[PDB]
């Protein structure tokens, strides 16, 4: 019924549009993403630029052209795609929910094993070992229940720089077994050999599944993983995307 591969390609399209980009990657976490107003977002940019004496002067003082598209860092992309998936009539504030609805990587592993295949779920993952935030989409399925990872990465941790559209264009469409994700996010991850750690991380999170792209010395060994796992309605995910496209 809903074409889910097209959902992702439509996120990519929205990101590629000069005005769609500003709708999608805005940082208003408290209000519904579909409550975002292009005129209002651009007026705020225009006023900030006029206040500093125009674009040339703004760029001199700030070092960025605020009309350029945003290449979102990991938390900016993950939290925005999460709102796209989870909001219906009511807003979802992912900053707030990550703190109040948090479960740990081992609680996640117990949860995922009893999710209804008749329902869709999404996990907002703050991996404090990696310093990296990403999403695991676990959509309803009449076959094997699997996850799909949506992420971007500034590249300052254990992984290389990764642009949201490059990831989504293909790897974001790759199913990951629930067992691999449980293994990745469990405390027992630490007990793995360096080789196995690089294999698991690269397989799930690296654009080319390349072990030589994983720098283990950038990982904070002791830390755990904070997860907010919630049900979502794919009809909301679809319509929220439609809504943004319409705004254009």
Numbering used by the authors: 50 to 297
List sentences from the manuscript.
One family of T3S effectors, the Cifs, re-program the host cell cycle causing arrest at the G2/M or the G1/S transition. In this study the crystal structures of Cif from P. luminescences (CifPl) and B. pseudomallei (CifBp) are presented. The structures reveal a head-and-tail domain arrangement, with the head-domain adopting an overall fold similar to papain-like cysteine proteases. The structure of the tail-domain of CifPl and CifBp presents an extensive surface area adjacent to the active site suggestive of a binding surface for interaction with a specific substrate.
MALDI-TOF analysis of purified CifPl is consistent with cleavage after residue Lys48 of the full-length sequence (assuming no cleavage at the C-terminus; Proteomics Facility, JIC, Norwich). This removes the unstructured region from the N-terminus that was identified bioinformatically, without the addition of exogenous protease. For CifPl, the N-terminal ∼48 residues are cleaved prior to crystallisation, therefore ∼2 residues expected to be in the crystallised protein but are not observed in the electron density. In CifPl the equivalent residues are Cys123, His181 and Gln200; in CifBp they are Cys90, His145 and Gln165. The active site cysteine is located at the N-terminus of 13 residue α-helix (α5) with the side chains of His181 and Gln200 arising from the β2 and β3-strands respectively. The thiol group of the putative catalytic cysteine is positioned 3.9 Å from the Nδ1 atom of His181 (CifPl numbering). The orientation of His181 is stabilised by a hydrogen bond from the Nε2 atom of this residue to the Oε1 atom of Gln200 (2.7 Å, CifPl numbering). The side chain of Asp202 (CifPl numbering) projects into a solvated pocket in Cifs and could be involved in either modulating the electrostatic properties of the active site or substrate binding. Mass fingerprinting analysis of CifPl localises the site of modification to the cysteine-containing peptide ‘IDESVSELGGLEMYQEMVGVNPYDPTEPVCGLSAQNIFK’, which shifts from 4261.5 Da (theoretical mass of 4260.8 Da) to 4472.8 Da (theoretical mass 4471.7 Da), an experimentally measured shift of 211.3 Da.
